[PDB]
Amino acid sequence: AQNNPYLFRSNKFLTLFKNQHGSLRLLQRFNEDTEKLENLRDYRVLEYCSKPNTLLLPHHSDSDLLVLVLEGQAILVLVNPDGRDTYKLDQGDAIKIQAGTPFYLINPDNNQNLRILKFAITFRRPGTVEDFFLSSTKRLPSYLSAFSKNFLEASYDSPYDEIEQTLLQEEQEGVIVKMPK
């Protein structure tokens, strides 16, 4: 949207990534419409659904998150230098997941979808939310593939060959993924 009704009621999220196995929609930034919501102009509201037996592939946010389960059974994992952190999420179970972490969650076995409500608290590009995914997908590769063979081979010391095949696929309908497990 844009220059429409300056109200305090919204109903149109933007679908960033979309497939049938899950969804990920962004609520427009508060102040767009109005000159009345310029406080929260540096705050995005996120919604994220998926279906039973899914892995949200690994990525990190530049932004400070807030995660709320608006219906579902979760398993959250934040990952560092010395360990992983492991907590199973539930209705209400809301968590703080701070800027930069690389994170990945799942939906377990108890029958239904997981709807998550995510609260972003922004600061590089205020209001502005961005998630760098580790791996590669249809029309948005990896990030690690942005530098070159040079710069990359250097770093692992195993060739742009080995390194590629392990790093560079096209996970089909993939950000949001399904399993046997």
């Binding site: 590089r124 250097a154 392990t166």
Partner: protein
């Protein structure tokens, strides 16, 4: 100079956060230093042997400013960076290609992945912004490896190769942060 030690004196670089035969990096946080907290500035200096490489990496909350004080540095930098777009397809993953000199400044945003190789026993100055408890998460190498911290079972799921491929390559590079420019 004088003698009356007291009234807001000084601060210098005692130790690297990181020291490898390849390089060094000294770093004052507002968590260590008493003056700083008040600006929300991270001090940092570095020492890069006429051959090192800063292993692919990002600061979780810090936008680093980096002036190259001694030498010439090749700067590599990745980013996706402008959602004032109505979808994703729209914005793109561009690569920041640039080598500096004796007067060059470079700003490194909060979550962007970059590395510098040495093209001289090059000395780097960098002032850390928004930097109250910022993590230097590393994507390569031995240490400070996050990846390596993603389990065998998510790994497969996460990049064609599985436990095998994924697990192993990270394990190849027995170095650390600073590493062989060993250009090819």
């Amino acid at each position: 100079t004088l003698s009356s030690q007291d009234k807001p004196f000084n601060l210098r670089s005692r130790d690297p956060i990181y020291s490898n035969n390849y390089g060094k990096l000294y770093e004052i946080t507002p968590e260590k230093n008493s003056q700083l907290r008040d600006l929300d500035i991270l001090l940092n200096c570095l020492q890069m042997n006429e051959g090192a490489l800063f292993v692919p990496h990002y600061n979780s909350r810090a936008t680093v400013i980096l002036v190259a004080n001694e030498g010439r540095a090749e700067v590599e930098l990745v980013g996706l960076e402008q959602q004032q777009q109505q979808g994703l397809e729209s914005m793109q993953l561009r690569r920041y290609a640039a080598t500096l000199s004796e007067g060059d400044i470079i700003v490194i945003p909060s979550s962007f992945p970059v590395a510098l190789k040495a093209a001289s026993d090059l000395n780097m100055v960098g002032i850390g912004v928004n930097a109250e408890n910022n993590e230097r998460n590393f994507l390569a190498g031995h240490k400070e490896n996050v990846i390596r911290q993603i389990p065998r079972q998510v790994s497969d799921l996460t990049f064609p190769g599985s436990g095998e491929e994924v697990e192993e390559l990270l394990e190849n590079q027995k170095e650390s942060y600073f590493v062989d420019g060993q250009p090819r």
